[model samples]
Target: APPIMGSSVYITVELAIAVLAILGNVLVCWAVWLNSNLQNVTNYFVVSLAAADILVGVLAIPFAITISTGFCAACHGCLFIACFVLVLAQSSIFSLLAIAIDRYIAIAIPLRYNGLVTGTRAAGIIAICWVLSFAIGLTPMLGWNNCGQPKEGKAHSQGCGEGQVACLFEDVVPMNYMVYFNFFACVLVPLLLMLGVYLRIFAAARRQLADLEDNWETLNDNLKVIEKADNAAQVKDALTKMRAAALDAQKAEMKDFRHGFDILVGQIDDALKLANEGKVKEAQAAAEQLKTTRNAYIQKYLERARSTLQKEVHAAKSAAIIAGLFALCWLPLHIINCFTFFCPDCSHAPLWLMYLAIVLAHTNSVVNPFIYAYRIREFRQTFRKIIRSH
Candidate 1:
């Protein structure tokens, strides 16, 4: 039996952690599923995250205990459990990465977010996460586990002591291959990619906010100009009203003018008509009125256009903030995992440090649902209803 098997405290703590993780992830999945309002592309990824966490709770914890107690019936059993745990871990991280990407696209180019991240595309992404995770996790089973076992093989207790079965270096796998593959495929590549994505998201958000401010400034400037023109028009009441009446009466003429098109030709024709009857001054005055009306139409269009972009910018900012919280919860564990993979000798890392790493990694599953509940109002409200009802 493993050295830790006789320790009651260890078993109790492990089981307690496992049970809590299970409950936490279950609640997250349940809330997401039962709540109709949570049915969207982003929320779908969140649900997938919860499901992966639940897999850790269901499979990883029991497997950890089995390994600790030296209770694995065979080497194949240990390998299977190790692969299952890895797949769940990879899937969870990938789901989180997908969430970040989804937010990036949604906030950065919101005008096309719906088209870019449709239900089918999101589903495909979720599928790809699971598929890639399984592929990586099966590396050992597919003959990458040549980490120095004898040709005749050895007993489980001889080879698989103290969770060494899961260590790529200890299992006789090629050291350089294992180190580079684990570092790049599982750690560095995804981490660096996510960092780049987050950077872009922040940049896009800044630009969107600047655009909102610029559009608002333009609208205010045009409004001021229109106000001054309206004040001036009041000084020449007779001619102003006559021109306004003519513009309003011919609403089709007003349509083209509202679009800022060249509707002035028709007004020039009318002016020529007036000049033909010797009303030269009146014709000249009408030409000025046309310019003022065109400016008013363009200003109104600018106001309407800016309003939607401003609203979308604010919404995107909120979603980005929530994504930031998710990254914080997971980042440390990933860093720790990478460190352990590169320095597996414990020359640089103590046993306590290893235990802490495992705890921190599992704690992520517990933390994510809380982050969602806190940052997202819609999710918060739904979670509240679930709590109240139960």
Candidate 2:
């Protein structure tokens, strides 16, 4: 192993990935520490994922460098490190899967969300993910490796003659198991399932949003019909003032119409504060209550307005509503793995291609934190809070 090709660049990028991975994912842990609001089932799954990434930075990458660049110089030591690295990597995906399942359940069946996704259930699911990862990842240690002398028409590690073995990844690990069982079954299939889950969730959410808009328009139209002559003039004056505050969405500092619009404006401001602070669920809930209340007001008040109202809006209680880089980074490597296994004519992948895949995979480790900060409001706010607090 005389300074193997590209080891220097591998070490450089490897260490950098480790540093950024540890720093970014650790902040996620600190977020859960400071904010009790993030202690829910979905957030816990995210925390579990960060934990796995952190462990890879600390333990797996260093040992991975050692085993890849040089040698374990011992049979069992290399096997242990190889299996441990795979286990942690598996944990990353499994935790990611957990979050998707949690999200799908929360959106698709919201009423039963709290009941089904309890902390106890979350902890149990995370435990299963880790345990299964370890068991499956370490299966090579059980007897499937290229450890001892090669049998007829079989392969063996570089220095595996006698009672010794080298720690090269390809030497010890079987591509069939790596590609077919682990990559296909453990990784690819789970991701495809997540895709399908997200697809259905999108359709459901769009219809849900559409229903709310209709309910709102119907409520507002029928509400204005309650005005008639003097009462109408008086109510419109009050309603006009409420509309001003509602547009500003401030609790901007009423008699019959005064009291009604006063509470309505208060609800508007209540929704505003939470909406701006990343509690959109609570904000939307407040808006929903206001929506239903105004509809009820329209029904009773307009009935007494001595006029026929327009068509109702689903009546009252309508329903409720609510990856490419991944392929580039990891898919090529997995494709290489599968092709190496299935395509007998293909030569071993070049060192440059291999190093490129390694660097890309490690790069994805840091990329996730960026994505979380960008795509998730809570993470973005919590990250800002962490900076301010420090």
Candidate 3:
């Protein structure tokens, strides 16, 4: 193969991330199926994410890597890259958007999240992601300027990302309109919604914690009153029993609310702190604390009361993570894309390297499932069981 353009430094990093993403997502899905404990509605959505990732690896990445190898024929040239890139990119973005909505509904309306986010609903969302992905990808077929552009000084038009894949709809839809539509629908709206949902979740959780602190304070005050009672000996046994019950109830509520948040907060804060301090091991410690607390809950109590909230939190967190990751993944591609407006040699990027970038881009779809497994205990347990059975 001919030497492809771009920094070799980037190639190794991108390739490694893509392979890790694929392996991680596949393992998550496999583990869930094997673990009966993890098999649930949430895992079903995860399976959806894994399936999309798998498709990108199989259907999208190969074409991208091929083009990178400098195997450019007019027939398989820009057009193939255009179709492959557009479909996978759109699908991945749309899937994240679906997850965002799922999370919003889950957290905001905990009581109804399960009924609303049913297996059928999840299937519908996945189907929508694919259908919309294909439709957006096909925009070039209609000569949409956003999807494909006319190659300057050439007799034929071409797609936005590729050279020979000229769109057929240059006369039908306005390019600027399509660009704005994509920016808003695919990027802006989804991000804005995700931010709003996350903000609400954080605020609500904060209030819950505050209320818990207040209740604990009140319990302490009550215990002091019981200690001061004149018939203290006679009432001691009764007061003790009541205190124990209150303690149990209060502990249960607090455990339900804070179990995962403590870990999540610790992880997030530890990372921020580590950025400033090199010896920061707090994040890992926090993660361990979170796991210990969570396992204790599962072992000692039924997840029946707070299962809905847990699911909602899981959905919302997944959305936030994937959306952020996509923004990062697409940053480089978008940079090159925007620069194409100014740099005529933008396509001058080495064949093999550009293809690697494209392949890595498609593999963004693979990360969300692994993230789900990393976060969700039931999913992890189910996956472990599945592996054991296999």
The runs of at least 3 residues in candidate 1 whose Cα sits more than 4 Å from the true structure, single-residue gaps closed, are: 1-10, 70-73, 147-178, 222-348
Write one digit per residue (lDDT tens) for candidate 2, span 89-155. 6787777666666666765676688998899988998999899989888888888777764231221
| Candidate 2 Cα errors over 4 Å, as ranges | 1-5, 70-72, 149-162, 213-327
User: Which is superior by TM-score, 1 or 2?
Assistant: 2
Instruction: Supply the TM-score for candidate 1.
Output: 0.68
Candidate 2 residue-pair clash tally: 1
TM-score of each: 0.68, 0.70, 0.60
lDDT of 3 by residue, 1-390 (tens): 334445354455545556766776777767766666666565565666676676665555555444443332343234545465566666666665665666566555656877777878777777877888777765645544432433343323222333433322222234343345554466666667767767787666555545445544543454444444444332333334433534444344656555544443444344334323433244233223433543554323334434544565555665578778777766655444444434666564554544455545655766666666677677666666666876
Q: Worst 10-residue stretch by lDDT in candidate 3?
A: 164-173
- Looking at candidate 2, the ten consecutive residues that score lowest on lDDT are 313-322
lDDT by residue (185-227, candidate 1, tens digit) is: 6855776677787678767766765654554454344333433
lDDT of each: 0.60, 0.65, 0.54
Query: Which candidate should be chosen as best, given lDDT against the real structure?
Result: 2
TM-score of the candidate numbered 2? 0.70
Which candidate number would show the highest TM-score if scored against the true structure?
A: 2
